[PDB]
Structure formats: structure tokens, C-alpha cells
Amino acid sequence: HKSEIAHRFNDLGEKHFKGLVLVAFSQYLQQCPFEDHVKLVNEVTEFAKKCAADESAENCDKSLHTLFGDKLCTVATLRATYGELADCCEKQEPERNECFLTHKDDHPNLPKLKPEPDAQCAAFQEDPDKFLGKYLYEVARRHPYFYGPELLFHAEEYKADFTECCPADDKLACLIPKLDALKERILLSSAKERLKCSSFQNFGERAVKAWSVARLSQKFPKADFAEVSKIVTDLTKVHKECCHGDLLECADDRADLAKYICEHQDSISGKLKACCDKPLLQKSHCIAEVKEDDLPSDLPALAADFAEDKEICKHYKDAKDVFLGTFLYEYSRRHPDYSVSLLLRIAKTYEATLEKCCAEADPPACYRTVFDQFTPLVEEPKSLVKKNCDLFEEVGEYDFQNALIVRYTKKAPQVSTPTLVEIGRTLGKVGSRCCKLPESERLPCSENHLALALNRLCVLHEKTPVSEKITKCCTDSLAERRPCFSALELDEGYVPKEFKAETFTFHADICTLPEDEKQIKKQSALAELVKHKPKATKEQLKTVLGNFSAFVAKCCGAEDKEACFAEEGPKLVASSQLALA
Ligand SMILES: [Co+2]
Ligand SMILES: [Co+2]
Ligand SMILES: [Co+2]
Ligand SMILES: [Co+2]
Ligand SMILES: [Co+2]
């Protein structure tokens, strides 16, 4: 007590306190070795215990920021590895931490993490703490904005894959499909929490609260506006702190909110009963990803209050954030069939139909049909989702991914080929995740997951800005980002890329690659086709990539793969310019 450091240490416990302070330090210094962070973890941790014992020991009075920040300025070769971070060390808090966050790196391009079941199981055995703590470090620097408490959860069950399939008979066919499943849920968690951190950075806490109201209202329609307002206030603080690097306060404020949600579960949702009977970290996760509660029979008509009342302009002018807050709570809770972005688009439209109407002579007759200005906003997303699932169901993940790589390469021919491939592929996964779902939960799954995919494209675009069309879609409006991108067409001020034969030249190296890595090189080539002939129809490119695949399939199954690529490759590179006029 009387010390911020000692206090968390006490409540969170050493294991987690360390766990979070390692993740925190990994995210900030992505370049440093694993053992250089352990000693910063152990030096800080030592200080927590020393402060815990004696709360008037030197500098124990200082803030987490000053402590974590002072410890980030004592590391080896900070100027050599991170010349940018050195300058941050000159400034004091909070100026320093903001500077620190500035130089976080969203695409550091480190080796992809490979399941190596021989060694990893062996390292887990000599030191389990080390092998698992090394997994915290690894994902923490590849995802500088991951949800630290949610990582400790992913790191407690990465261990429960090695408690199962380390002593077992088959060391890969027990382990790989679970470490490959962990990875697809890592990539999803990171995306969700990058979109929360991105929302603060570009749009603010008003935007993150509005999103939360919509989402939580949909999940907890039984809860009243005071419960939702409270959980949103609390959940927002949890995310603001996690995104700014206060992973200690983030883990305590999140556990307090779990404690609360669970104490009040009968008033909030009947779905929570399952989540609240579980251990600490399992509780927070089960709540974060919980099924939506059944729509309540006693849901009120909104016509009366939001369209029919004659003193709405008074309600609205007297306190707007509140009245609009209430609207969003009410419309969201009765529309779980809707996407968060769509609900916020509708809230933004409801708002604009009062700002205008309340200046006209008779407002009530102006906003009486406000609700039928929502129908058009609902049709558009529902079309695209049916348009995209009808194509997906017909041609599969690969051909759908290929179709989207052409769509987005035409809208943004200046974005790099890896970025276009990753986004097209990330978007292609959407069809796999949402189209098979009950069509009831199809529009929400599709749009909410397009929001994660587009947000990454924006994160990358901040780092490496190439296109003014992509800037406007990423920065103007959070609600309208997907509609903004959907609306983009081919940039006709684009100069088609000077044809380089080496780009469309394949060799036998590709025949060794796993299926996934083989597609990326083919999809990489597709993007480069669209760049060279932007006007080429999607039907021309699908045919020319077909000719490329056939060509790869054949030569990979030749006695002389090397000679086959040598003879056929050039013939195909030349015939493809003429197929794409
Ligand atoms: Co406490
Ligand atoms: Co900020
Ligand atoms: Co702070
Ligand atoms: Co309705
Ligand atoms: Co990349």
C-alpha cells in the first residue's frame, strides 16, 4: 500500500505481474533478445517486492509510467537498435510514453512462428516457465497492441497443448492442428484489439464508447441503459490503458469489470452463468466472446419516443450525447441481426435528421419518418454480403480470395503486393467464417470481420502511405469505412506498372512449399498482373492465373522440374500480356 507498483504486485500476483510486465516490455522493444527483457522483468519485479515490504523506500512513490519508462532507458544499445526511442528517453512522463507508443511497429516482418514439436517439448521440459514466457515475448513483439490479459490466457492454454501432446505417441498430429488453431484465434484477437486501439488513435474515446454501446446492447438486450452505460465506461477504460501500455492497471480494471458483470449476471444476461463459474482469465474471455442473450418479450416500441414525441428537440438539445446514447442502446438491442458499423451509421443518420429538422418551423412532421431513412442503409450491406457469399459458396476460399485481391488491387494499385495479398486473404477467410453460419448471424459476422481486415490495411497504410483514396476511407469516418472502400473504383490516374518478366517468372523452389505458401506466390503474381493491366476484367485475370497454376502443377510433377519452368515459364509470361488487353 501507499505505492502503485507494490499494490498491483500484491493483487495480480507475481506470476501474472511478471507475465504482463514481460509482454508490456516485448511490445515496446520488439528488437531486444528474450533474456534482456527477463532481467528488466526481474529488476522491476524485485522493486515491487522491495516496495511491497517498505512503501517509503526510494522512488517507490513513482508511477508505473516513470518506472516502466525509466527501465526502458537502461536497456542495452537503445540508440543502436532504436535511434527513434532514444529521443523519447530525453522527455519525462506522459510525453515519453506517447513518444514510446509512436515508435511501436505493426509490421516488423519477423520469422513466421513454426510448430517444431521435437525441440519445443524438450525446452518446455528443462524450463517450462522459460519456454512459455518466450511465447509471451514472441507474440507480444509481433503484435505490439495485443490484449495483454487476453495473451496470458492464450499463453496458459498454449501450455495446455504441451500438457497434452508432449509425452504422447504422435507429437505433430496431436499438437499442430491445435497450435494452428491457437494461431487463427491469435490473428483474430489481435485484429479485434488493434481496431479498439486504432479507434482511440484516429477517432477518439467518443467513437470507442459508441461502438461498445452498440455491441454490448446487442449481446445484453436484457440489461437496462444504466448497466450498459456502466460496463461501457469500465470496458473503455480497460482498453484505453491496454492500448497505452498500462497492462498492469488493464489487467486489474478488466478483472474488477468481470467481478461486477458476474455479480449482476441475472440482471445482464442468462448466457453469463456459464462464464462466471470459471477461473479468472477464462471468465474475462468467456464474457468477451459470449453468445448474445435472447431478445426480451417486453422490448418497448421506439416510434413513441424517437419519432412520435413532440419534445424530442428539447430532449436532444438539453443533452445530446445522452439522448443519442439512449437511441443507440434501444435500436442496437432489438437489432442483433445488424453490424456494429451499420448501427453506428444509423445512429449518425438519426442524429443528422434532428440537427436539420430542429431548425425547420414544425420539426415533428420533419422527423416523423426518421426511421424509414434507415431502410436504405440496411439494404446495401445485406446485398454485398449475399453478393460475396454466393461467389464464395461457388468458387471456394482461394478463388474468392483471388476475386478480392483483384477488387482491392484495382482500388489501390499503389499498396504493396504483400499487403494486398494479406488483406485479400484476410477478407477471403470472412466467407469461410460467416457464409456457413445461420444466415441470421451472417451480415454481422461479415461486416464486423471486414472492419478488422480494413483496419489492418489502414494500420499498414499509416506506416507506409501510398494512396490519398485509402487515406480518406481510413481517417474520415469509422462508421463509413467499409462503405467508403466498397465505393472506391479503379484509380484511372494510375500509371500501369512497367512489366518486369522476373515478377511473373516461377522456379522449382515453389514445388517444396506448403499449400498456403504456394498460393501466396501465385496470389502475389495475380496482384502484379492487375498492377500491369488495371483495366483487365476479373474474368481475364482468373483465366491467366489458371494458366499459371496449371503451369506450376505440371512442372512440379516433371522428372526435370528445373528444365520445365525454364522452357514453359517464358512462353506463359509473353502470352499473358496479350490475354490482359
Ligand atoms: Co488493488
Ligand atoms: Co492515445
Ligand atoms: Co497511463
Ligand atoms: Co427494426
Ligand atoms: Co506482412
Author numbering: 3 to 583
Task: Please share text taken word for word from the publication where this structure appeared.
HSA is the most abundant protein in plasma (ca. 600–700 μM) and is the main carrier for Co2+ when present in the circulation.
In the case of ESA, a total of seven structures from crystals soaked with CoCl2 solutions at resolutions of 2.3–2.8 Å were determined and examined (data not shown for six crystal structures). The presence of cobalt in the ESA crystals was confirmed by fluorescence spectra with the excitation energy at 12 664 eV (0.979 Å) using HKL-3000, which showed characteristic peaks for cobalt. The crystals of HSA in complex with Co2+ belong to the C2 space group, while the ESA crystal structure presented belongs to the P61 space group. In NEFA-free ESA, additionally Glu251 coordinates in outer-sphere mode, forming a hydrogen bond with one of the Co2+-bound water molecules. Of the sites without histidine engagement, two are formed by a single aspartate (XII and XIV), three are formed by a single glutamate (XIII, XV and XVI), and one is formed by one alanine and one glutamate (XIV). Of eight of these sites involving histidine residues, six are formed by a single histidine (V, VI, VIII, IX, X and XI), one is formed by a single histidine and a single glutamate (VII), and one involves the backbone amide nitrogens of His3 and Ala2 and a glutamate (IV).
